[PDB]
């Protein structure tokens, strides 16, 4: 409603770097807000794509940003009569970034890994890896919970069970308020998908450079399955956290699985032991129900609500015709211990191929009316196909069915304006929470400042 679309702020990265693929707000130890931007195709030292991260100080004029530096060199260790190697070429560092306290977590989901033992090998596969930095102190750490040293022959003899070689850990990521990092790995267990969790403190204290294979004893991974409904389901394509079981001492996980059960799609709520509390089934096959999830209480009852994006949902139109426009589902949490029922509201896109619902960002209370609000992205929507971001305000019954404000892309065609979103933080300290929008196709980030209600 009250986001300023006239005076924007633009940050830019190098050409072809996909600067803006992911972003988040970052508060330093003194509470100063900055923007962490991922650029998963930034050129490394060898003039090869490896990815990179940028830490943008807040300036109303925007501009260039300094680099948050990470080790981009491939590593080799000969130990235990084996050879461990990491491959950072085209790893996509910055395909996801998230911030917690004064720590930044940036992940390279396509970092490859292999183990050599005489003539045998583990197979060069994308296990992924996340990089952790404390910018003010310069401290660095890594976390790669799917690296292994089992040889390829063993997986074949055991029918590829507990096969963590294709995790792509860091595909999606989130941190609990207590400091538990939770990673999505949709290629886990031969493309079923898994979750990997560990405290940020234990990641730092157990890491030493050059080890490549180490234990984080406090970590906890999800489990493999024999159920064909989960095969090729990409469980962990998107992840989020919230409070859904009434007990305020436990943190619940929300996991998107957009190809679950033969591309029907699903979203599941779990406790921190990965036991399942609820499952939301997709409405239409191949709609990618679960592509995006977000957790926020929109109707002001203190109970976290859930929205699910299905960006490829095909809406029924005249003459038995379907139109791919996208759809967002809202699930209000009922009182006490009960199951999330049918959707409370269905928001459906308008522009063909607009992919309405590709990203869903909680805004906090934008207009300061006591109810929390959201922003939904249609990166190829709008009358010109350049992309739109639509704001929906909360109310006592959930969300408004029509947008209070639409943000048209300020970038050229093909920028994917809205592919990444992040709100609910006051970056200019004016008392109203703001919105940063990534356009990786244009290698830029746009900042929308909220203003007093007109």
């Amino acid at each position, epitope marked *: 409603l009250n986001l300023d679309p006239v005076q924007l702020t633009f940050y830019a990265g190098p050409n072809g770097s996909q600067f803006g693929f992911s972003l988040d707000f970052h508060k330093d130890s003194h509470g100063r807000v900055a923007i962490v931007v991922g650029a998963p195709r930034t050129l490394g030292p060898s003039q090869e794509e490896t990815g990179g991260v940028f830490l943008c100080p807040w300036r109303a004029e925007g501009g260039q940003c300094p680099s948050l530096l990470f080790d981009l060199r491939d590593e080799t*260790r*000969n*130990v*235990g*009569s084996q050879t461990l190697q990491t491959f950072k070429a085209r790893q996509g560092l910055g395909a996801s970034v998230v911030s917690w306290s004064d720590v930044i977590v940036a992940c390279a989901p396509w970092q490859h890994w292999n183990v050599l033992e005489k003539t045998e090998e583990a197979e060069k596969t994308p296990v992924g890896s996340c990089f952790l930095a404390q910018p003010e102190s310069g401290r660095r750490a890594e976390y790669s919970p799917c690296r292994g*040293n089992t040889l390829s022959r*063993i997986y074949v003899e*055991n029918d590829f069970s507990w096969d963590k070689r294709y995790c792509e850990a860091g595909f999606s990521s989130v941190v609990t308020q207590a400091g538990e990092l939770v990673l999505g790995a949709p290629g886990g267990y031969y493309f079923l998908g898994l979750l990997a969790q560990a405290p940020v403190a234990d990641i730092f204290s*157990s890491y*030493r450079p*050059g*080890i490549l*294979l*180490w*234990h984080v*004893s406090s970590q906890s991974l999800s489990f493999d399955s024999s159920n064909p409904e989960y095969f090729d389901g990409y469980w962990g394509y998107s992840v989020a956290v919230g409070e859904f079981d009434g007990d305020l001492n436990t943190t619940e996980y929300v996991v998107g699985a957009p190809t679950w059960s033969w591309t029907l799609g699903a979203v599941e709520i779990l406790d921190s032991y990965y036991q399942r509390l609820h499952r939301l089934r997709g409405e239409q096959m191949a709609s990618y129900f679960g592509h995006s999830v977000a957790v926020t209480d929109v109707n002001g009852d203190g109970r976290h609500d859930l929205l699910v994006g299905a960006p490829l949902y095909m809406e029924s139109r005249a003459d038995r015709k379907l139109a791919e426009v996208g759809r967002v589902y809202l699930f209000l949490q009922p009182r006490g211990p009960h199951a999330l029922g049918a959707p409370s509201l269905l928001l459906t896109g308008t522009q063909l191929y607009g992919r309405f619902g590709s990203a869903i960002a909680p805004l906090g209370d934008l207009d300061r009316d006591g109810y929390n609000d959201i922003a939904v992205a249609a990166p190829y929507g709008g009358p010109s196909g350049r992309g739109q971001v639509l704001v929906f305000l909360g109310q006592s019954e959930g969300l408004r069915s029509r947008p209070s404000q639409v943000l048209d892309s300020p970038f050229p065609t093909g920028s994917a304006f809205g592919f990444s979103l992040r709100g609910a933080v006051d970056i200019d300290d004016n008392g109203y929470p703001d919105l940063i929008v990534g356009a990786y196709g244009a290698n830029q980030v746009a900042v929308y400042r909220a203003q007093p209600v007109v």
Partner: antibody, heavy 119, light 108 residues
Framework: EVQLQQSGAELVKPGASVKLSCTASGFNIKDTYVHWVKQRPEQGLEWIGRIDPANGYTKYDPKFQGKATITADTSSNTAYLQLSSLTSEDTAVYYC????????????WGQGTSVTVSS | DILMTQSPSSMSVSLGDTVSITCHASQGISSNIGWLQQKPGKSFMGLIYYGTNLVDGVPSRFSGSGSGADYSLTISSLDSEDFADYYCVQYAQLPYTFGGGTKLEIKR
């Protein structure tokens, strides 16, 4: 806390067989490799082998191929070292070892199990 | 196998001294070495792993260093509990092989 509580001291005859235990307290024995080491005052420290209790796979020093057999039961959170066709030279103290962080290290040690072969 | 030649066999020193054990390997082991402590009549305690990294709970007067095939454990300002046995161990190759040992004895 990570503690490795081994079985009590054994006393056996040559030609017989003994089976030692190493119980994980405060953690899951499935987490890391578990090694076995033999200590004599003259010969010093010798590495017997290792097991990955997650899958039962083992490695051995060829010096101990035949005498040493390493197993593990994740149910009782315990690893085992079985010794067969015992001899005077098999009189030593046996330790179970696991790493702290580095997958291949040797950082935590049990208290040690004393074995004595004699007729 | 890989031979771990640990020197000296023993040494007589006093409290507050800065002593240094060494360990030579028959080939390059690229810092894949650990250092151990065995107090008299007791079990073992890990000190160093991967050449220079202190095991959790070890005082900082202990320290490790070296490269290639030659490494050293140093105890700056000896304490009374530091008089015990010390072993190096390699894990660059299977089978793991230990050093001969080094006993720290009281000088008088």
């Amino acid at each position: 806390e990570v503690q490795l509580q081994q079985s009590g001291a054994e006393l056996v005859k040559p030609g017989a067989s003994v089976k030692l235990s190493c119980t994980a307290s405060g953690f899951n024995i499935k987490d890391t490799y578990v090694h076995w080491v033999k200590q004599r005052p003259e010969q010093g420290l010798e590495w017997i082998g290792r097991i990955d209790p997650a899958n039962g796979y083992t490695k051995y020093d060829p010096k101990f191929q035949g005498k040493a057999t390493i197993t593990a039961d994740t149910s009782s959170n315990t690893a085992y070292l079985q010794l067969s066709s015992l001899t005077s030279e098999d009189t030593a103290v046996y330790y179970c070892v696991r790493p702290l962080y580095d997958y291949y290290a040797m950082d935590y040690w049990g208290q040690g199990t004393s074995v004595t072969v004699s007729s | 196998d890989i031979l771990m030649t640990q020197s000296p066999s023993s040494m007589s020193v006093s409290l507050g001294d800065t002593v240094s054990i060494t360990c030579h390997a028959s080939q390059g082991i690229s810092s894949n070495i650990g250092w151990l402590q065995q107090k008299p009549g007791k079990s073992f305690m890990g000190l160093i792993y991967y050449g220079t990294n202190l095991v959790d709970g070890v005082p900082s007067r202990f320290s490790g260093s070296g490269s290639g095939a030659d490494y050293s454990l140093t105890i700056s300002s000896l304490d009374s509990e530091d008089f015990a046995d010390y072993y190096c161990v390699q894990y660059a190759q299977l089978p793991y092989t230990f050093g001969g040992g080094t006993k720290l004895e009281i000088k008088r």
